[PDB]
Design a protein around this nucleic acid. Structure first.
Lengths: 143, 37, 100, 53, 50
RNA sequence: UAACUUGGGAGUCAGAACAUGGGUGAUAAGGUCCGUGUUCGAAAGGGAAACAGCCCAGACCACCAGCUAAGGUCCCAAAAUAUAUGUUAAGUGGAAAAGGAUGUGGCGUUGCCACAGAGUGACACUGCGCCGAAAAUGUACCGGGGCUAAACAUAUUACCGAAGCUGUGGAUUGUCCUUUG
RNA sequence: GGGAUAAGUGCUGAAAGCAUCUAAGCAUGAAGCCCCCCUCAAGAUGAGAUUUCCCAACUUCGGUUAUAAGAUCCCUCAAAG
């Protein structure tokens, strides 16, 4: 029974910054959902969280491939009879680019009490700057 | 304009072009104009 | 100085004075055993290779033969009058490593 | 279905009446006269703002 | 209508979270020296002393 | 490695789907009535999103051990953002016909070197797409995010993957005693 | 009233010397879509912002304590219920 598990006491976490310039929405989202989850460090510890905080920058520059800016609809419901709304992925990005990236990455993390706490490590901002200079966020390069 | 599953020419003048993923037939005589074959 | 032995159809990481539990051997309590199949000698000492290192035996003393904690094997199939109940205690041997 | 009509407590809620008109503003008493009626009971607070349309 | 399921000891003891009577809220009288009800007379000897 | 013979004790006489030969119905029905196989009934485990009957495989018990089957390898979710060569722009992939069409690859066969100069018109045979395509609480026919390759045809090389096989301990029951075992 | 569009109408323009609303590009176009108009809304656990008010005594706890700004028990009531 020689197996090592990691507890809150022995876990540390880093801060990274990813740039969305010239990146596909689904080719960037997949790689960020493996950092938040902590599948790059040797002590995986599925019961405990070991992931790292990431900061997206320039999230407007995100790019879609083929006729999607007018042929991809995001639907929602408000529980009232007949109330079902929709907005095209083009207009969403010219309106609220933080939401676009942030609702694609979260559809790749599990839906449990623990995947809800790993979705709070994602900070998204359209501008080339970010207000988190108080830490030491080092850059991470997507492969 | 006449919309029908089958669009074929009727005179020497009529011509068959394609706009926006649809097959139509422009032509001089406005009675010959048809779309979506 | 840790090594990787291969005793009971399994492998075990071993350190000096570590208490390790393995499957039932024939050696009597209070005797001294030895392991002839060592796979990896490393850590502080020189990294070595495989299938098996040349020589490199590991020695230990036998402390107790025993029988593990009891479990109960119950199963059934619903709407069909069929059940079954069994017990089990798996035997073991406890050793202490003293020379790698 | 959410949004059904059932019994419940009614009134008490903020109401607006648009496009009303002023008649005489009577300084030395500080009273205005507005052509029409105004929501609320007597001795109650009302607001008066220029129309948006 | 009748009840479809029984009610457990847990769901029964939550309902009575609020089924309790409050303190009568009394004060000492500056004659009797004995606790009396506020805005009433001292029963022990009647002196309202408004 | 089964067979037959005489004696003791029985249960069963409402069957179901799937594939393949046929009646009947309308070359309708999870329809029904026969022949021939298998699985369920009386069968757990892995895949098909969930799903008695479909593809793989038959659980004596214990283990933080190995190699495989169907099916798979961007994230949820274990293992290739692998390699080489091609196709498809519709989100086809991820429901459907008669018919219609200068969509685009191949392959040939040809008439004329003009058709309005470097080339031009007519035919088969085929790969993959387009239109035809309208329903009732809520997107709602990829399981979801998402994808222009993470889609499709062809060929190799690894890897994951079950209570299957193996490795080491234990338990009962039969056959042999290669060693009172 | 402004914004982006549906069926249609085009302008420029090739693949195909011409022709052609489309492939690159530039417009116009509905009681419908999104803001404008009217109420609710920070338990929006992502819990926001603004101006004001109060702020020492005991400790070997590294914390305790009542009291401050303030709000209630109780009582007289209606524009409320």
């Amino acid at each position: 029974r020689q197996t090592f598990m990691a507890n809150e006491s022995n876990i540390e976490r880093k801060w990274y910054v990813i740039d969305a310039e010239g990146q596909t929405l689904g080719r960037l989202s997949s790689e960020v959902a493996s950092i938040l989850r902590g599948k790059n460090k040797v002590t995986y510890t599925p019961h405990v969280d070991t992931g790292d905080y990431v900061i997206v920058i320039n999230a407007s520059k995100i790019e879609f491939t083929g006729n999607k800016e007018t042929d991809k609809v995001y639907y929602r419901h408000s529980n009232h009879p007949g109330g079902i709304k929709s907005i095209t992925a083009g207009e969403l990005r010219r309106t609220n680019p933080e939401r676009l990236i942030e609702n694609s990455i979260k559809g790749m993390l599990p839906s449990t009490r623990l995947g809800e706490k790993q979705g709070k490590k994602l900070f998204v901002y359209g501008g080339a700057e970010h207000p988190h200079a108080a830490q030491q966020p080092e850059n991470y390069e997507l492969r | 304009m006449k919309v029908r599953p089958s669009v074929k020419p009727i005179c020497e003048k009529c011509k068959v072009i394609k706009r926006k993923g649809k097959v139509m037939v422009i032509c001089e005589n406005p009675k010959h104009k048809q779309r979506q074959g | 100085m840790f090594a990787i032995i291969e005793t009971g159809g399994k492998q075990i990481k071993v350190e000096e004075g570590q208490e390790i539990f393995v499957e039932k051997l024939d050696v009597n309590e209070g005797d001294t055993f030895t392991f002839d199949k060592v796979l990896f000698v490393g850590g502080d000492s020189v990294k070595v290779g495989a299938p098996t290192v040349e020589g490199a035996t590991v020695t230990a003393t036998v402390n107790k033969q025993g029988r593990g904690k009891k479990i109960t094997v119950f199963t059934y199939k619903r709407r069909k009058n069929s059940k079954r109940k069994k017990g089990h205690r798996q035997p073991y041997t406890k050793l202490t490593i003293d020379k790698i | 279905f959410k949004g059904q009509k059932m019994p419940g407590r009614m009134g008490g809620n903020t109401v607006t009446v648009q496009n009303l008109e002023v008649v005489q503003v009577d300084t030395e008493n500080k009273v205005i006269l507005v052509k029409g009626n105004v929501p609320g009971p007597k001795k109650g607070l009302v607001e008066i703002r220029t129309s948006i349309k | 209508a009748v009840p479809k399921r029984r009610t457990s000891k847990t769901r029964k003891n939550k309902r009575r979270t609020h089924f309790k009577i409050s303190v009568p809220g009394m004060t000492e009288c500056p004659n009797c020296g004995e606790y009396k009800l506020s805005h009433r007379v001292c029963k022990n000897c009647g002196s309202y002393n408004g």
